[PDB]
Amino acid sequence: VFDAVIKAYKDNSDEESYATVYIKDPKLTIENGKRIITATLKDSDFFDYLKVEFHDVKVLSEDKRKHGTKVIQFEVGELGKRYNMQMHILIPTLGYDKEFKIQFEVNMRTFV
């Protein structure tokens, strides 16, 4: 179990994606000799779905207080590599209905 960081990218562009701000305190655990990312998804209510290379991420916990906050989890093959990720952002009051495909690499926060 390690302090981890997730870097998101605006699809093909290598400029940092906005979604990065909606994911905080990423943590990397290793089970069965396999790499598992457990991350906090802030403002969860605006996420109709969140898929990773596609299957939805699994939600360990759900909070409903401040526009939702779901502790999400998924698996990664290798650390340093880019991975395709899809999301549906749905904000009824706005109303913001858009689906996005970005790329994300998950790393170790600090040096080992």
Q: Which residues bind ligand HEM (CB under 6 A)?
A: 10-11, 17-19, 22, 43, 46, 89, 96, 100, 102
Residues contacting 54, CB < 8 A, separation 6+: 84, 86
* Amino acid in the structure at residue 74: F
Which stretches of 1-112 are assigned E, i.e. beta strand?
Answer: 2-9, 23-31, 34-42, 47-52, 55-56, 58-63, 69-76, 83-91, 96-108
Residue 102 CB, shortest distance to ligand HEM, in Å, is 5
Instruction: Closer to ligand HEM by CB, 33 or 92: give it.
Output: 92
Task: Give the shortest CB-107-to-ligand HEM separation in angstroms.
Answer: 18
Which residue do the tokens 């549906």 mark? 88
Closer CB to ligand HEM, residue 28 or residue 50? 50
- Taking the complex as a whole, the smallest distance from the CB of residue 11 to ligand HEM amounts, in Å, to 6
Query: Nearer to ligand HEM by C-beta: 35 or 100?
Result: 100
Closer Cβ to ligand HEM, 44 or 73, answer by number: 44
**Alpha-carbon distance 99 to 29, whole Å?**
29
Q: How far is the CB of 63 from ligand HEM (least distance, A)?
A: 15
Tokens encoding 23: 């994911």
